[model samples]
Target: AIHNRAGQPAQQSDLINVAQLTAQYYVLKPEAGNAEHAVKFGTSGHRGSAGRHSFNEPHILAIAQAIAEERAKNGITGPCYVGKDTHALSEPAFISVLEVLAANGVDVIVQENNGFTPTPAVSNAILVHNKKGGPLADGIVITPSHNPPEDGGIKYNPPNGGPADTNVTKVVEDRANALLAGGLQGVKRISLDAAMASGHVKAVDLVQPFVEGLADIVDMAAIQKAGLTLGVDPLGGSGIEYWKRIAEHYKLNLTLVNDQVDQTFRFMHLDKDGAIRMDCSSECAMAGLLALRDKFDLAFANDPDYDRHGIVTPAGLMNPNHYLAVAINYLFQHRPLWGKDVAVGKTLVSSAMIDRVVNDLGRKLVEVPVGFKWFVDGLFDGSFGFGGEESAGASFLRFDGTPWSTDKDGIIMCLLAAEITAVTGKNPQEHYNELAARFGAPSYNRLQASATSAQKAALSKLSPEMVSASTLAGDPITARLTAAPGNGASIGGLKVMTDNGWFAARPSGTEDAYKIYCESFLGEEHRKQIEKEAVEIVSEVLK
Candidate 1:
């Protein structure tokens, strides 16, 4: 069930106290043996609120020390690119990281003018630095992404310029938690002032080089020549300045609707649960931009970290899955310079519409599990021309088929929507209409169901044979998979598919619930049937 205050503006009660939150980051300390205070790192990195004692200064310091040690063991010798979003806690956490890094004798780069940096920009900087073949650079992004105002997150990207794999995150998480358990006894540290003064922390223009490199990835000339009016809402995210620089450099007709970077995100429309989340994909969160659909030929929004995008046309905000499909179709056809063998990558939970589009185009589909990290190697090696998730995050290769950014590039994805309009003479939504007409539009939705720890553990280890049903929603069950066919990695749950519909059940990484992602080309009623049966199937299996 969704919250009723979906499209409303965030009330005062929903706002977070910036000063209190930042102060808590320094004042609070997590208890050594408390499971809640453990340095739990997932696909995105460690995320929590300082008030919860899970993301306090101690946690950040331990993580930073752990990262410094890990990098040394791996022979990484380049400067670390450190970037922060607009989260209230991000600044304090960044300071903690710098203290440890500086004491560890690691070189750090912050944005010039002390400006906020988006996740992709950090990834871009690392890629550009490592590409020149010196000491292999790495980066860290302090952001909770689209989480609510009260939350903060920090993730590490190795020299590969993507989210670190489990092998790496497991090492960092274990070491950080160990340090926390030891009361940070041996953790290296220096005052932020001393770190800044130690000649270890350097400021550089991360925006200019990234902005200037846009032409090589997307067709900036085509977008400039098309003269299509565009609108962008940064959602008080870190990419506000990047958009300004991008528009100016490309000489495109783009307007920045909301550029305020308040940590409380006071200007945001409320999310589904009446929280101050900067989720660009949620129609309710993007209601402000949606209401202005008529002002620009195309409009887009990005989350606080600027890693995801939401596209709006006269038809309204395009569903993230729809946009992903449209983007994949457009890139495959338009990127003539890319080798035909460069496959398209998608998360397993993404709509089958992408599979259909890729099939029709005679392109290989490299479907992985839910995390964007799975696509890292392929994207870095130019094996995946495009890697996307259903959750509005995606990135493609440069025109010459080389890696642009291993992380999601929300800026380029937004610009590509404008370029699509310019080159194809149709907005992405219109192009999706045509795609639907050709491939039979599918309905997709994700819902969460309550689960106990035992039940969740059951779902995570589910097998194909666990479901004995031969058919689903009147069609024969084509396959039941526990691992992604592309990489043979565990799906962490089960995905049941039929000719016309499919459903995947996976336990949420951070919640006491299981997520069911279902889709049907057979229509809404069939989709509902799949959902209903999906629950029953999972329920029986758990029992």
Candidate 2:
């Protein structure tokens, strides 16, 4: 349930103790036998609160050591680009990562000014370094994307310059757990000062090159020439300095609303659960930015890692799904240099409005399972023009049909909205309105229901045969899918589709709940009906 102060400013009680959290990262250690203490990687990364003893210094040390060993095993011999956000734990994790890497004789690159580094910048740096035909480089980002203030995270990207695939993360996770259970005996680490003085850890500017390359992706000149006042709230994120450099480099009229980089994030409004979260897509998390929407022609915000975006217009904050649809429509039509054969990639659970838009543009749709890693190779090879998740993480090829970044670039995505307004003379929200007029409006909702471990396992392994219902919510079930139709990859759940409505049910990766994503073009009533039946069907199958 949403808290009473969901969209209100954070109170003193909502703040976290940065000092205590960092101290716990050094003092607390995980037990080897406990499953909760194991090194587990979810869709994004290995994340947990140090207060829980799940993400302490030992965990980071073991994970980094395991990564060095894995890279050696794979014959990867390049510097590991390390970056961190503005989170309190990230600072310690960054030092922990560097110590292990330096002790392992692995070269590491970091931001020149020791400033907070965005996830996209880390990804961009990896791609650029690898493309130069030298040793293949990889990266690690030390921020829990949009999680609460107390949480800390670490994610690894291989030479592919994207989220590590399940195969890679599985190996790393297993090794890390093994090392942790051994009391980190095999993990080598040097002091932070010695690591920096060892000459293996090099600091370089990551923002300038990334900012100067914006012209290759979005029409920055058009945005500059349009002279529309744009507002950005980094949400006290890693991109705080990057935004300023971007504005100055592109010569665009931009204003930063909330520039405070306090690790407690006390400047943010309370989220739906009365917690301090930096989720840009949540209305409650973005309530502060939405309040100042009228002051600028357009405004936007990004999560702490700068990998997800939320667009704000005079009309207000646009739903992430609506913005995705708008982005797909605008990019395909405007980027003439992009080949017609380049596919549009999306997750299976994303709004079908994207499918309709892609179809109308005469482009193929490559629907994958719920992860951005599936789009990595496609974006790297320029076979996919755009790949996006419903959660507001996405990236595309450069304007000249070359790779921009294999991972999500929220900065460019936010800038593209302004570019659309500059060139088309209309905001992204207005463009979405036109799209809605063409394709019928869709009502969509995602809800969670409790589930046991056994039930969640059953849901994950479900098949068409398990779902005996021939009709769903008064419509003939046209398809019952356990895998994505586009890529034939396991959906890890079940999806049932009809002519006017559809519902997909999947077990949450990190929580003991199942999520039902239901949508209907008919109306909200039909959407509710679909959701209800979906729950019933999943429950019956699990039983």
Candidate 3:
């Protein structure tokens, strides 16, 4: 039975809903972007309905063509690493991208035996190759980061081995979509088998290079010395093998949990909506690892493609926001290798607790929007030492304050928790508690509600004058933001910021809904009230 946003019946469809159809279309007709092709790409890749013309071959081909052109313009003339997850549409899209990229005359690299490569492994490969300076190598990872099945996505990491900045993605998105809308009439074409046969598409093992190099960024040697036991639930992600190697290389006692990979994600206990997703940070999805948390000093999990990580410790899987705060506090204090001036990068939607932590530590915090691309420049240079997301994705410099991976390196993050426990004899959560004791605890939550196109537009364009309310749920309003104060980029909705509380309402790009992320220092009840009032405020403005 199809359920609504509130877990209740919304409407009855005469036939099977999008999920069943999407699955069928992916397996049978496999028509690209017909309605079945789920929108899965963004900071991760391009995502949309395959049945409706969102995740079609045209889009991938156009994106490939754009990538080829962009790389050529940037003098990044080297072999490109490519990988995909276990999503049903992954194989087919992989075939299409191979033809398009090879036709453009760029060499493509993959895992041994063309196996699935996690997002972090691709980033590591790009960094290692570029470090050698043989040629400026880059990579393309084809996964939706942590989106559901029936979804396919593609993202490019340039020579820096990080998510591509808007300088590249903007052009790529525009050109690719234009090419798709034009029926790909002028799009370059090549056969998949021929492309693979061209010798340009070959396999390179990235797991070992990345796994063995942990000591470079983290104190893996120290972790081994301390003899910390760790639990890692791969959640059927691309980095499953790398975890085992990390334990072996570091000689640490590590238990790599549940190496199962299923296209249907059957192993994952259903999320709140009963949907299958590999979001390791979601309390529902991360429940499995959390259940077994007591067995190890620390436990961590990653999304299907392993770009984002979730840390579980004695205190439980730290909320992504809290984890972000804890990571900032610890890296700034513990990573002695980092320069005194190294900056911290975060997304606008992340908790302000990080802001408080950074301020208390007297460090700079660079806040961008949802995409990791915005943090690339700071990460590549020594300027921003670490870049992280509230959505369980982050990457940092190695101990020497040098570039570890310009992209989100989930493997390192998952291991960092263990290293913390091994070295400090305190798990990251315990460490976080220390920080909270020093810097006051904060509570936060994020929820979404359905909205119409016009309502969404109104919410995005809302002005301060539109909201005349002087007080909200009791507290007086301090600021109403339509754009992120850090970068002056429109947050795509209104954000009501108070002294100790804030609520952001933003429209989803694909869905007919606007997400409201609310926070309060008072507690969970006050946080819920903030959410309730947040919806009412947005609704008033919409009306």
Candidate 4:
């Protein structure tokens, strides 16, 4: 349904000349501001199309300036680490952000080759640097997570080294929009060439540092000693180089499946929507890798910038919730190195399978809203040892039971699948079966429906009193929550639970709709029934 407004796909050569093509692409595309310039800054970051007014040179610059000012206000005058992915607009955005940062006298860091670095790798570096007790370093990663190639994004990682929380983004967005309207009046500028020369923006080696640090997180020795035949498809993410380095450095029997780094993501198997996206967990995007699953002990893939993981086991590609359950079960039971006090972390929308797993493991569960940012402080201070999202983003502590990364580490997670296969002689899917046999399996799905902003607000504020229902999906209502039970934080929406089914409705941060995530242990039919009932419940509340 998406027509290439350019009348044709941009030529292969056209994407390579990023700096020149970006400005030209914006000018010639004639599609700027076709819709509202709603560059909504959500819990993760600001994401939009560069060809649109939502993502332009001024936007990135203003964001960087706001970050710099934020750091200064917090009395954290440390150097800022900035990295970009291979998106067509990344370089231009990087250049613009660097100009403002340098002009503001903020020190910046990048990779030595001036190449791409994944979201987690940047966070890992920040954690490592802060461990040495030098000037506390924060970071900015240029990526839109798993969006289409045409879109661009800019995310900030504060000193704690995770996605900037909602509070932080609001500051950046308000300042940036004000600056844009003022014609960037108070914005300072500097030359990219000059900024590089000033040594304020120096290049570091992201791959080596991150790869060398992996042994501390994953049990590479155990995996290598087991002689696990591992396959990894970076899907042309920022962690591509890091995987190769890990294979060589650890001398592990690992294979790098795909080496292409095209920004257009031409190598990606189409998404369910038949769009070119790097969401490795999507059946469409991961179909190619899944086809060759039998070739290795374990095969895995990652999103474009490699913050989240997509695991392919011998049985099949495991569901994100199933994998989370498997991960928690394996980790809590096998992690003798980690103290029993380490908590299991998950987003509110993640399947209750994790809750069941935590109960079985006798571990604590700390549930937050859907963002990696919420777990950063916990991971840094060791309040929570492992964290995961239903959308396939997750991370955990190192082998010695120390925090490995404050951000999600897809590279480590991809390798963890191989390590799991090596140690257990059972692929993730097989492991999932064992888990299901032990714990009740739940069927789950996430769906979205269009709604106006007012309708969305109404949905998020719904209470059980508004629903006036004592039962759902043929089961007596056990509990209703307008807030997350684990953290007692408002879910920004509503969730209803019965003995065998539950549904949660929350507004999408980047869309004009609310997402309804529902589950039923009884099966698909009951799940749909719960979903249907949830809609009625929400519609009544909204109306």
Each model's Cα RMSD: 1.1, 1.1, 4.3, 3.3
Which pairs clash inside model 2?
Answer: none
Q: What is the TM-score of each candidate against the true structure?
A: 0.98, 0.98, 0.89, 0.93
Off by over 4 Å in 3: 1-41, 49-56, 181-183
Where in model 2 is the C-alpha error above 4 Å?
none
Q: Which scores greater on TM-score, model 1 or model 3?
A: 1
Q: Poorest 10 consecutive residues of model 4 by lDDT?
A: 1-10
Tell me which of candidates 2 and 4 scores higher on TM-score. 2
Candidate 4 TM-score to native: 0.93
Give the RMSD in angstroms, all C-alphas superposed, for model 3: 4.3
Question: Among all windows of ten consecutive residues in candidate 2, which has the lowest summed lDDT?
Answer: 36-45
Question: Candidate 3: what lDDT?
Answer: 0.77
- Over the stretch 115-167, how does candidate 3's per-residue lDDT look in tens digits? 88887778777877887868788888888767776566788888888887656
Which tens-of-lDDT digit does each residue in 107-166 have in candidate 1? 999998878999999999999999899998999999999988879899999999999999
Question: Model-by-model lDDT, in order?
Answer: 0.91, 0.90, 0.77, 0.80
Error of 3 at 266 (Å): 2.7
At residue 326, give the lDDT of candidate 4: 80
Write candidate 4's Cα lDDT for 178-285 as tens digits. Answer: 766666688888888888887788887878878888877777877888887778888878878887888899998878787998866666766665567778787667
Range of the 10 consecutive residues with the lowest summed lDDT in candidate 3: 6-15
